[PDB]
Each structure stands twice: as C-alpha cells, then as structure tokens.
C-alpha cells in the first residue's frame, strides 16, 4: 500500500495525457495554456478532459470543480491537493 507521487512527475503525467488528445496540438502546448480562452476548444471537450483525468487517477473530482479549472497548472495543483502529496 505505497505508491508515492511527486509534483513534477504528476505534472508531467497530466501534460502527457493532454498531449495525447487528438484535436489540440502539441505545437503550442504548455502549463500556462487556458482551455476556453486561447486554445479555442469547447467546454464540452474540456469536460471530456476532466473525465479523462478522473478515469486515469481513480477519484471523482466534484461537479462544482468541473467548471472553473481551464488550465493544466490548477489541475495539477488540485490533484496534488486531493492526494495530499508534498514533503
């Protein structure tokens, strides 16, 4: 009962599985990249994204928090908060 996690590693995993997605690009992809603002994709695909994060990391994030993340940095911060992973 011990898998440990990190900040940099789990951020690389979230950026990895965002890079895996089809109709965005890895061309202009970074952690400071808003979804609805300047990547142009719909909120529908944004909730498919949050669905992918839930389906990989194995815990439901609440429906109040399926609304207002929109960027990978706050995603990595929120997953690190729910899993309580710091040193």
């Amino acid at each position: 009962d011990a898998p440990p996690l990190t900040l940099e590693g789990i951020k690389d995993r979230v950026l990895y599985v965002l890079k895996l997605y089809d109709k965005i690009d890895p061309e202009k992809l970074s952690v400071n990249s808003h979804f609805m603002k300047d990547l142009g994709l719909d909120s529908l695909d944004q909730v498919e994204i949050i669905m992918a994060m839930e389906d990989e990391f194995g815990f439901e994030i609440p429906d109040i928090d399926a609304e207002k993340l929109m960027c990978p940095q706050e995603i990595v911060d929120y997953i690190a908060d729910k899993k309580d992973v710091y040193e």
């Binding site: 909730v47 389906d55 439901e60 109040i64 899993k83 309580d84």
Partner: protein, 176 residues
C-alpha cells in the same frame, strides 16, 4: 445548492447531465471500444444542436433529456472507490485523529518527540500571534450588512496569512 451562488446556469445543468450521462454510459458499456463508439454518438447527439439561439427549446429538450436519461440509467454505476457512495468512503478513517489533540500528552511522551513539538509550539504561537488585527479588521471591513456568499477573500490587503485557515490547513493527510 452550491457555495458560490444559487442558480447554476442552464449551461451548468446541461454540463452536469453530460458528465452523469457519460459516466452512466461508462458503467453500461464495458470492453471500452463500444464505449468509445457510443460516447462519441452521445457527443454527436449534443452537437446536433450547437446553433441553438432559442431558450425555451433548449430547456424543453433538456427536460426531455432528463426523461430519456431516467428511462435508461444504470442501477449500480461504476462509482470511483474513494468518492462518497463508493467502496472506500473514508475507509481509512481509522486513524484520522483530529489535530487539536496531540497537545494533551504526558511530558515524558513529549520528551520522546522534541523537535516536532518545538515546531508545533511555534506554529501555535503563529496561530494566536496573528488572529486579532488581521482577521477582525477583514471580517468587519469586507462584509456588507449581509455576507451573502461563502467563499471568503484572503488577506490581500497588507501582510500575513489569509483569515479563517486553521481547520482548513491542519486537516489529516487522508493516508494515515
């Protein structure tokens, strides 16, 4: 029913139904490839009508979506086994001992753990050290005659820590 506001929106209700319907299709639809098929069929169903400028048409289709969803939901959906409802649901609440304790110990047991107790004593001195002026001035400055919201703003004015923080920071680690 939510801490930010009262009304969700039409879009927020549509979106919550979208997440719940997609999760129920996940639960219906094992081997995952027929799931991908039917999930993109559902995505097609909601992009049938992207161009909806009307409002009563949208809400009536939403009510019929609730009808057609409750007509075909699944009894035991795959709920994630750490969430409420799931298989854990504070499974490891055997050791979520609250942290107002670890202050009523015997002093030989407190001699066993010296440096951690010195650090906890200086955190507690920090807690009482910055209660009066900052938190009282913010909780008498920023509230209107009704507070009328639940998310609270930080101590962005001048200096130290945001108010009302002790039992939000010092919670157990969810793996004790």
């Amino acid at each position: 029913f939510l801490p930010s506001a009262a009304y969700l929106t039409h879009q927020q209700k549509v979106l919550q139904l979208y997440k719940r319907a997609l999760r129920h299709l996940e639960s219906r639809c094992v081997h995952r490839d027929k799931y991908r098929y039917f999930a993109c069929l559902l995505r097609a169903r909601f992009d049938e009508h992207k161009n909806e400028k009307d409002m009563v048409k949208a809400t009536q289709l939403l009510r019929e979506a609730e009808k057609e969803f409750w007509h075909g939901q699944h009894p035991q959906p795959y709920i994630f086994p750490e969430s409420p409802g799931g298989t854990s649901y504070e499974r490891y609440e055997c050791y979520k001992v609250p942290e107002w304790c670890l202050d009523d110990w015997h002093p030989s047991e407190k001699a066993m753990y010296p440096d951690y107790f010195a650090k906890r004593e200086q955190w507690k001195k920090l807690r009482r050290e910055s209660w009066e002026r900052e938190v009282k001035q913010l909780q008498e400055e920023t509230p209107v005659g009704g507070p009328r919201t639940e998310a609270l703003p930080p101590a962005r004015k001048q200096g130290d820590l945001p108010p009302l923080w002790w039992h939000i920071v010092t919670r157990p680690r969810e793996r004790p």
